[PDB]
Amino acid sequence: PEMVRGQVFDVGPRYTNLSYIGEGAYGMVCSAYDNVNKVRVAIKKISPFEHQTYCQRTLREIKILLRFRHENIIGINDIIRAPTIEQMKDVYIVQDLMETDLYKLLKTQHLSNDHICYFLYQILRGLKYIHSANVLHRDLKPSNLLLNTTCDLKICDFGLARVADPDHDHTGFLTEYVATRWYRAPEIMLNSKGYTKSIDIWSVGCILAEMLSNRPIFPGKHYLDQLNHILGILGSPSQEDLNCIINLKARNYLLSLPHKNKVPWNRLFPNADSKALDLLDKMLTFNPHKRIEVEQALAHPYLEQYYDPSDEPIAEAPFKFLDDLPKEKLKELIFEETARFQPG
Numbered sequence: 653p654e655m656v657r658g659q660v661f662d663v664g665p666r667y668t669n670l671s672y673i674g675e676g677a678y679g680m681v682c683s684a685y686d687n688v689n690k691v692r693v694a695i696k697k698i699s700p701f702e703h704q705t706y707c708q709r710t711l712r713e714i715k716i717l718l719r720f721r722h723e724n725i726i727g728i729n730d731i732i733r734a735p736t737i738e739q740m741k742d743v744y745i746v747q748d749l750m751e752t753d754l755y756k757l758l759k760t761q762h763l764s765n766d767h768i769c770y771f772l773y774q775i776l777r778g779l780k781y782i783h784s785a786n787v788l789h790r791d792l793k794p795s796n797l798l799l800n801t802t803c804d805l806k807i808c809d810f811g812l813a814r815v816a817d818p819d820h821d822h823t824g825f826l827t828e829y830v831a832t833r834w835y836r837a838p839e840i841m842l843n844s845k846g847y848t849k850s851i852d853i854w855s856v857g858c859i860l861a862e863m864l865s866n867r868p869i870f871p872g873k874h875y876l877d878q879l880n881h882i883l884g885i886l887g888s889p890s891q892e893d894l895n896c897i898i899n900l901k902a903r904n905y906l907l908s909l910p911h912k913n914k915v916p917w918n919r920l921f922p923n924a925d926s927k928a929l930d931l932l933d934k935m936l937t938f939n940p941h942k943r944i945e946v947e948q949a950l951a952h953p954y955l956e957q958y959y960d961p962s963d964e965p966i967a968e969a970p971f972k973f974l975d976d977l978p979k980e981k982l983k984e985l986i987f988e989e990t991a992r993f994q995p996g
């Protein structure tokens with residue numbers, strides 16, 4: 653088998669001529685040449701079988717991506733794994749190879765307002781489909797938005813995705829959370845498990861802000877510092893917004909803070925389109941109940957040159973309610989879920 657950086661990367665003979673890209677916390681991503689459909693492709697090595705939570709996230713991701721078909725969402729082209737459960741130590745997911753991601757682009761390139769608009773349109777178009785399937789991405793951030801040489805955009809990394817569960821969203825104050833800190837909505841730190849669609853809208857708002865200045869808008873250094881940053885721009889929550897936080901610890905924390913004034917969006921982003929700032933304001937609304945939804949965002953005047961609901965598809969087959977299964981049963985389900993890609 654092909655070797656890369658002291659790891660077997662066992663994907664031949666269909667897939668040859670490998671180069672390293674990067675690596676997540678339990679597997680490496682490479683590019684490779686696909687000898688059947690004569691193009692280079694991206695391949696992710698996943699090694700989840702020692703741990704139940706890694707099994708759960710691998711299974712969820714595979715199930716979601718195999719169900720989804722959308723121009724603004726990365727698909728699965730192929731899955732490679734051993735012919736038997738016994739021999740199966742790793743799974744490789746083959747996906748379209750993209751040129752770059754929005755994190756890399758923002759570190760190097762000024763975006764014109766027309767690029768911002770197009771990127772934001774595509775993000776929201778992909779997100780409309782995801783949300784229409786009753787799925788939350790839960791880790792939207794620039795590095796999970798892939799781009800090609802003509803600026804087509806695809807959302808990737810459904811490793812933290814979940815089926816939406818708004819009636820079980822409530823939790824206590826300072827409850828630990830998995831998703832990337834700088835893109836976390838204020839309510840995660842206060843009283844939310846991140847099981848409602850509004851969690852994703854907040855992240856998109858953070859992305860839009862970052863496209864406007866090339867800098868993250870709320871770069872907290874740790875859990876409660878993230879809320880310090882959010883409130884330093886939005887200002888103190890209104891009485892009405894506090895009344896929706898019934899949990900006393902969270903409410904009393906907010907009440908304990910000195911008054912903070914809102915920083916006007918046009919002072920933070922003096923070169924921005926006024927319509928982009930109006931949409932930004934509605935995405936970065938403190939109260940998740942008042943936060944704009946994806947379909948409203950699409951219909952916003954900023955996006956009027958692209959908006960076309962007949963060309964913003966929804967999912968044919970949304971998901972419903974698989975968390976007490978042990979890792980051995982989860983291996984059998986991953987083996988079952990990947991069986992369509994085998995020879996035979």
Ligand SMILES: O=C1NCc2ccc(-c3nc(NC4CCOCC4)ncc3Cl)cc21
Pocket residue numbers: 673674676681694696726747748749750751752753756798808809810
């Ligand atoms: O799902 C994921 N999590 C971690 C990751 C890394 C990379 C990819 C990925 N990258 C690329 N192209 C790179 C090329 C160099 O510039 C950055 C983008 N193309 C397809 C995929 Cl599927 C997907 C994931």
